[PDB]
């Protein structure tokens, strides 16, 4: 009764013709435990060493090798306001080597320097850890949904480059990771107000924002875009909060020019080609010439989870229900074949160390290989 | 609305002739005082019309077109 809605369902998985076969699903399970709760933590093949973990305060170092469980530590304050203080984290997995930095939505940040072990310095911060830190020039940059923008130091921390942005009263659940180049940190937004910080005291180069956002005359719940600038050649290509293609050709400063095109999910830059999915859940490609789009796709329209990853000429795509969709002999290559779980999938995939890296909504890893 | 009634008699009795018409109370010597203070104003110049309910309350003829 609570869910009595006729929303568009999955345009189903197509035929499973793929002469490419998944030769492995190397198994291992911390078993936790995400269920369906919101975050984007994700595999990072740090020297193929996998400090594995999950949604309890669980950790164990593994390796893209059949994953031996190393460095298992109990990650919860059994002291303080509570016993184990239930450890729940909307902050992506970060390391520098074994320096497993991380920050918690509970307004706490930690540097599990498993280059030296559990040398972790607790941080009662202004705001809540909702975005991914950026380890650049010995600094860390994040976007809390506190409107604020702080910066600290690896394994020690100190408040600096203090900035604050604007919010929509609806307090949308949006985040944005900064994209720095030469100390020119270019971050996305959630109200559409976009900035490009030079860490002077965290000073921006900006006078404008994308004309497109959500919150007052609100828009679809399918313009879903992973708001993060991607800079090539200094030519920043934007991924506006609403479906609006934009290219910000930054040149020793902020330059903007909006070659508009709707359907914002996210994009991958490779020279003159992009391989992107549309906000309406269909995968496109584009030539960077003003917005010449290519690569029709409709067979998988309004599939719920979309998670593509390109390696070995294979933009492998992860959807939920433990399915795996494969891009290949690129268009006219659109067919896909795999479903390794029913546990479903929920987050971003990475192809690191030439290997593929996957988490299940519960259960650590079933390492699929072409 | 009716029980074989309610054509030329107000609902129930008509006190149109049971009520008290004006009975001027003489204001005595020095008992002069506002005789009334309200909406109670009437021109005696009226009628001669509906004393007792026998009048055409029923809808009179008007032009349809």
């Amino acid at each position: 009764f609570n869910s009595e809605e006729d929303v568009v369902k999955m345009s189903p998985l197509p035929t499973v013709e793929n002469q490419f076969t998944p030769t492995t699903a190397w198994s291992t399970s911390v078993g936790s435990g995400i269920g369906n709760f919101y975050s984007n933590l994700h595999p990072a093949l740090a020297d193929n060493v996998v400090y594995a973990a999950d949604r309890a305060g669980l950790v164990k170092a593994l390796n893209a090798d059949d994953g031996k469980e190393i460095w298992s530590v109990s990650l919860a304050e059994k002291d303080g306001w509570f016993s184990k203080e239930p450890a729940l984290l909307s902050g992506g997995v970060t390391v520098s080597g074994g320096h497993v930095y991380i920050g918690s939505e509970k307004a706490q940040v930690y540097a599990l320097n498993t280059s030296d072990g559990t040398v972790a310095w607790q941080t009662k911060v202004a705001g809540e850890a909702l975005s991914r830190p950026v380890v650049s020039d010995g600094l860390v940059l994040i976007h809390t949904s506190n409107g604020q923008l702080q910066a600290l130091n690896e394994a020690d921390g100190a408040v600096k480059w203090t900035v604050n942005l604007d919010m929509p009263s609806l307090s949308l659940r949006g985040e944005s990771a900064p994209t720095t180049a030469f100390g020119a940190a270019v971050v996305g937004g959630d109200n559409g107000r976009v900035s490009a910080v030079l860490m002077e005291q965290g000073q921006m180069i900006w006078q404008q924002r994308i004309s497109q956002a959500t919150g007052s005359t609100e828009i679809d719940r399918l313009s879903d875009v992973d708001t993060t600038p991607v800079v090539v050649n200094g030519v920043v290509f934007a991924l506006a909060y609403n479906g609006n293609l934009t290219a910000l050709d930054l040149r020793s400063g902020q330059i903007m020019w909006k070659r508009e095109l709707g359907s914002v999910n996210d994009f991958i830059v490779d020279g003159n080609r992009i391989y992107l999915v549309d906000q309406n859940d269909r995968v496109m490609a584009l030539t960077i010439d003003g917005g010449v789009t290519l690569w029709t796709q409709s067979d998988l329209l309004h599939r719920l989870l979309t998670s593509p990853v390109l390696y070995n000429g294979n933009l492998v795509v992860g959807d939920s229900e433990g399915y795996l969709h494969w891009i290949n002999v690129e268009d006219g290559r659109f067919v896909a074949q795999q479903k390794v779980d029913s546990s479903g999938f929920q987050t971003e995939p990475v192809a690191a160390d030439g290997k593929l890296l996957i988490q299940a909504k519960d259960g650590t890893v079933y390492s699929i290989t072409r | 609305s009716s029980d074989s009634r309610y054509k030329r008699q107000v609902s129930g009795d008509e006190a149109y002739l049971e009520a008290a018409p004006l009975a001027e109370l003489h204001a005595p010597a020095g008992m002069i005082l506002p005789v009334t203070s309200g909406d109670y104003a009437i021109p005696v110049t009226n009628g001669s019309g509906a004393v007792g309910k026998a009048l055409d309350i029923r809808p009179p003829a008007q032009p349809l077109a």
Binding site: F1, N2, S3, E4, E5, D6, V7, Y38, W81, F82, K106, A107, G127, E128, S145, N146, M167, S169, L170, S171, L172, R173, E218, R221, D224 | -
Partner: protein
């Protein structure tokens, strides 16, 4: 170049008026810009726009139509809302439908309704309508809207809490992060309001902690666009305790500041809690309105001192004015006495002021229940520094208790019993109870009416009639031919304004004959000294009872028919004074004093139970027509009538003034002509009932009817036995000399009580290990 310009099909304005309205006329060379000017003139109308401007050669065809009117109606999809509410929101927003509704405004209104769904923090999936262009100009909209319902989606988040645990604080909150149901007393659905609520909730709480400094938190409503994900926090900054010390008062008043600090009795070094001084303050306002000066000016600042956590209280209070009253006016009793209303007061209009006496009279009204609105609208007169004006609006509850019945006359003419109960008797404040039963063999009369008031104080005088013809003879006799002519008048004298002490009387005639074979009758007759037969129903009796009656009643009851937290007790007792033809001692008590677990009182309890004991005065006994029974009623449901009581055995009456054939079995001619153990609830001389109930107006009902609908569940206990009892005559028969007769039943209770009549569906499956249960799991009480 156009010469004659024509317009056909106007129906609203003149052709020449159409020509002159647009800035174009005959005699100007109409070019493309001139056509466009005609167009923009047609568009400048504002009420109606349709351009069909044809021009071939030397003639100008201009054609215009009007979309008004559309009556967009059929809001379909109304599953948690009503179409009427949609129309009301539109008219209030300015979209009342006497409508032109150009083809544009469709999506505007669809998405506006949708946006309001979302304002509820809800969602409407799709809203698409159907055009119905009625061919005069009317149109309507089959407004088929779909829903994206998203209500119970909560997940709670607190930050800045560092002196009290997060979830402890989340506990007290309505909006509840999806906990199971079986602990439900209340609800948790989201709203921006309900947010602000929760906010102020913990605000109030934490500031009743004494923790002063917290006032700051940025509101940030996280939103997962998936019908459920609202994981919202607000960044609070908790405060600091102090310790409350010192008293300084500024009584700017006719002089009671001695009594002020006497009231504000704050011993030194006390603890800092704003609730305490809040209460004290309140008391002061009471004391002040107590003296007429009910319009003060008052302020206190907490001298919250740091490095000592000291908080002194500077206060300053300024008297109001002593005497005001101008008007005491009531709106609503258009078909009710207002004499009774101003009878529910105590003080004289035109004196000095006290808010007490007015709220007193008003709650006196509400103590009388019987109506459902207080309105104590009390303004000063515009035009004097004095002379306050009061207005009273109530909504009234009504009473009618009248009974209907005929037949079943199957072997008889259709039977004729009557019962009428119009109390507060609609003509007056009287109280009419008249009972007649004439089913072809009985003339039992009963009449009773009583005034509410008769003296300068309002004494209620009540007389009662009841004449009886109780024979129901099988053929002619040996069938308890009975006549009883009983009367009584009643009074009451409470001077506590709470509790009536009483001392009264009552009369009855009784004509008896045609005994029955039960032991009990002859037991009584012998106990009185009358020697009846044993094989013959050949005895009778006449009597007139000169017996005193004493009783009492309590009342602190908070409502009437749908009461709350009530408290009432009522005593009654019967002793026979010298001079009578019968002697017996009877005392009786009942009570209804309730307390609610719900303090919105949507769930209140029943504590109700009775006791009665009968016995004789010196030498005699309590007559069997005074014994105690029960069963199948709204005292114990699920039985047949009067099912509860001991059993009196038959004795052989094989010659009983025509001991008959084929009737009066168990020792008659036809029946087993020997002794009997007889199964019949003959009622005990000691009584008590146990029943404890809960007002449970279920969520299952569409909770829009609360003055007539009520829901509950019940349990009952039953046991009645004889105290003047033996076993030397009841050995081979069972014995009832003891509390031993337990019964138990439980079940449901619903009351959609039309004020004119309730129909009490009564299903009670009795579950107690006990015999003699002669039951009816179906009772329809009225």
């Amino acid at each position: 170049v156009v010469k004659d310009i024509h317009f056909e099909g106007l129906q609203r304005v003149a052709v020449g008026a159409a020509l002159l309205s647009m800035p174009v006329r005959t005699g100007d060379t109409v070019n493309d810009e001139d056509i466009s000017n005609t167009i923009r003139a047609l568009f400048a109308t504002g009420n109606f726009e349709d351009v069909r401007v044809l021009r071939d050669g030397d003639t100008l065809l201009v054609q215009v139509k009007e979309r008004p009117t559309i009556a967009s109606i059929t809001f379909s999809g109304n599953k948690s809302v009503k179409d009427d509410m949609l129309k009301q929101n539109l008219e209030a927003s300015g979209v009342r439908v006497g409508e032109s509704l150009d083809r544009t405004t469709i999506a505007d209104i669809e998405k506006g309704l949708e946006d309001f769904y979302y304002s509820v923090g809800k969602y409407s999936a799709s809203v698409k309508a159907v055009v119905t262009p009625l061919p005069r100009n009317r149109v309507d909209l089959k407004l088929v809207f779909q829903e994206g319902v998203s209500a119970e989606i909560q997940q709670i988040n607190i930050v800045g809490n560092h002196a009290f645990t997060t979830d402890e604080l989340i506990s007290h909150f309505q909006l509840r992060d999806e906990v199971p149901w079986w602990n439900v007393v209340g609800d948790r659905k989201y709203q921006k309001q309900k947010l602000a609520g929760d906010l102020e909730t913990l605000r109030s709480y934490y500031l009743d902690r004494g923790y002063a400094r917290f006032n700051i938190d940025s509101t940030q409503v996280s939103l997962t666009p998936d019908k459920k994900g609202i994981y919202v926090t607000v960044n609070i900054t908790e405060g600091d305790q102090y310790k409350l010390s010192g008293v300084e008062v500024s009584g700017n008043l006719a002089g009671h500041s001695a009594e002020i600090e006497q009231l504000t009795k704050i011993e030194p070094g006390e603890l800092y809690n704003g609730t305490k001084v809040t209460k004290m303050e309140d008391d002061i306002k009471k004391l002040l309105g107590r003296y007429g000066y009910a319009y003060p000016r008052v302020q206190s600042m907490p001298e919250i001192n740091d490095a000592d956590k000291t908080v002194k209280l500077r206060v300053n209070v300024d008297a109001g004015n002593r005497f005001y009253v101008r008007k005491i006016r009531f709106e609503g009793n258009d078909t009710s006495k207002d004499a009774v209303l101003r009878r529910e007061m105590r003080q004289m209009e035109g004196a000095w002021l006290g808010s007490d006496l007015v709220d007193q009279g008003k709650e006196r009204l509400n103590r009388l229940g019987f109506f459902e609105t207080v309105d104590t609208d009390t303004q000063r007169v515009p035009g004097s520094p004095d002379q306050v004006d009061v207005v009273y609006k109530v909504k009234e509850r009504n009473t009618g208790s009248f009974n209907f019945g005929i037949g079943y006359g199957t072997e008889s003419g259709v039977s004729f019993q009557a019962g009428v109960q119009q109390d507060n008797w609609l003509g007056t404040g009287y109280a009419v109870g008249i009972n007649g039963t004439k089913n072809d063999y009985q003339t039992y009369a009963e009449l009773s009416v009583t005034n509410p008031y008769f003296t300068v104080d309002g004494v209620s005088l009540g007389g009662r009639l009841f004449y009886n013809d109780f024979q129901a003879d099988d053929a002619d006799l040996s069938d308890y031919t009975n006549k009883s002519y009983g009367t009584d008048v009643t009074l009451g004298f409470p001077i506590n304004e709470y509790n009536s002490l009483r001392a009264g009387l009552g009369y009855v005639h009784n004509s008896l004959s045609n005994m029955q074979p039960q032991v009990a009758m002859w037991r009584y007759l012998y106990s009185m000294g009358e020697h009846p037969s044993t094989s013959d129903q050949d005895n009778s009796f006449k009597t007139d009872d000169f017996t005193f009656n004493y009783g009492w009643t309590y009342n602190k009851l908070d409502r009437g028919y749908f009461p709350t937290d009530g408290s009432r007790v009522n005593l009654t007792g019967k002793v026979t004074i010298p001079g009578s033809d019968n002697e017996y001692y009877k005392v009786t008590l009942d009570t209804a004093t309730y307390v609610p677990i719900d303090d919105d009182h949507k769930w209140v309890v029943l504590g109700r139970t009775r006791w009665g004991y009968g016995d004789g005065l010196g030498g005699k006994e309590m007559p069997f027509y005074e014994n105690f029974y029960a069963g199948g009623s709204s005292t114990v449901r699920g039985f047949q009538s009067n099912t509860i009581g001991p059993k009196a055995v038959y004795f052989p009456h094989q010659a009983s003034n025509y001991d008959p054939d084929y009737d009066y079995e168990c020792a008659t001619q036809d029946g087993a002509k020997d002794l009997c153990k007889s199964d019949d609830a003959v009622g005990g001389n000691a009584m008590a009932v146990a029943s404890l109930e809960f007002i449970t107006p279920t969520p299952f009902i569409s909770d829009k009817y609360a003055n007539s609908v009520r829901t509950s569940f019940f349990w009952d206990m039953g046991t009645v036995w004889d105290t003047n009892w033996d076993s030397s005559q009841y050995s081979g028969y069972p014995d009832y000399s003891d509390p031993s007769n337990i019964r138990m039943s439980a079940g449901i209770a619903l009351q959609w009580m039309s004020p004119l009549g309730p129909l009490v569906f009564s299903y009670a499956q009795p579950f107690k290990k006990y015999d003699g249960d002669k039951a009816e799991q179906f009772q329809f009480n009225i």
